[PDB]
Symmetry: C4
Subunit: 146 residues, 4 copies
């Protein structure tokens, strides 16, 4: 019933994407700030269901971009071997801070709510390319802060 979520940042309980075993995986990450590639070494990490690192994708080339960015993963590990099918957790680190010596973080399944869609007549959140049910949302806050 409420569309007050629109324009908020939503954190959802969807943190992984499915790799079928052969086909590429398109996925989207939301960056709250423009990526600055001089601030540490920004990168995406792809982890398996046991939180073991399977793949790292450098974010260097995305210097200057913010908001939702679309990526692809060929489903290979760091050697180039295609990994077992299943759910992979995708996260990212970017913009290392001088003082805290820590990176900003993001991950699949969070970002600005761009629209609310009513699906007969169930509410869905549009977040970049993802469309997610309301009850998957665990937290909301305003952009730029918190």
């Amino acid at each position: 019933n409420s569309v007050s979520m629109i324009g908020k940042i939503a954190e959802t309980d969807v943190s992984g994407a499915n790799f079928d075993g052969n086909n590429k995986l398109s996925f989207s990450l939301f960056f709250d700030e423009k990526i600055d590639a001089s601030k540490g070494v920004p990168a995406i990490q792809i982890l398996n269901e046991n939180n073991e690192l399977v793949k790292t994708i450098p974010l260097k080339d995305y210097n200057g971009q913010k908001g939702y960015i679309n990526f692809e993963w060929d489903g290979t590990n760091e050697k180039g071997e295609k990994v077992p099918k299943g759910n992979y957790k995708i996260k990212a680190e970017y913009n290392l801070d001088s003082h805290s010596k820590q990176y900003l973080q993001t991950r699949i399944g969070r970002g600005e709510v761009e629209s609310v869609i009513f699906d007969k007549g169930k509410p869905m959140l549009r977040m970049g390319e993802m469309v997610l049910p309301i009850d998957s949302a665990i937290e909301f806050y305003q952009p730029d802060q918190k």
Copy 2:
């Protein structure tokens, strides 16, 4: 219960207006941007229930206007013959973009929500001259984007 829709753009499942067979049809279209008549050839299209083009109304003369604009249709096709009574879908194209070579679009049954009215005590959306039930709404987003 919620009035968070106010100020949002709403897309509703109302896409047509009724022509009775003789009387003029007043209708309203929402333009997200000022119409610029130097950008392609802007026009309203009126289609019948089989999505067959019945009438075209040039938007040339509305250069400079934005928001809700009221129009009238005499119920004639392009020859001047009065068409069969029934539901007609009304859409529009305007502001052809140089790069994409595509026009912006709009249609009956979408636009800024100007107020929420409680009808004993059922919520209605006021959208220009139209007043529509909440459950007719299929999507909401913020103006200027998406």
Copy 3:
């Protein structure tokens, strides 16, 4: 459950105040624009249950003020006779427009929603000095427009 009404203008179905027969009546009116007393002759009208004019209070002296303003009525008609007890409708006209030759209007029971109060645990709207139940609200819109 929703506090999205806060900051909206609410129209409610409360349009009158009770006069007991002897005691003064405090009441509040919301002015959407600063009163300009050079623009026609601004005034409050007090009507009885049959919409018969009982009292007129000039708004001249409130030149420059906007928002919620508090007034008092001694319960007398234009002669100075105390009127029958009961419900009196209170309205106002101000800022005559040159073009339309019409005044802006306001009345008891509409205005900006300044806060939402939960009354164990029923939602109330705070509107100036008035505190009104949610279900008394018949319409909401954003200030400055509509």
Copy 4:
């Protein structure tokens, strides 16, 4: 269901914190305006369940700060004696006004709503370090006013 509370000031029915009898008490207060220590003498008051003053903490040193500030209380009264365990009400006064000759006030259990958290799937308000249920909220309004 609604996240319209985010960015509002909430007043809740939580006005006290628990002192166990030995361990320090961390607590947070929300200041709507920057503290100005030249404006009267700003201070926190800690009261017991009978509204008897147990401790005063000077706010002098927090000159210039606003929003949520974290404090600690060792659980001693003004002599330095550890007080009985139980619930203590914590309030504050700051920024004495020249005209009204009154201080602004604040207290535990009110402040800006920084996020809404869904706790399986019960809504919680994040207010500084405190996380409180929706039904503890008795009033909402916009920051800077009311």
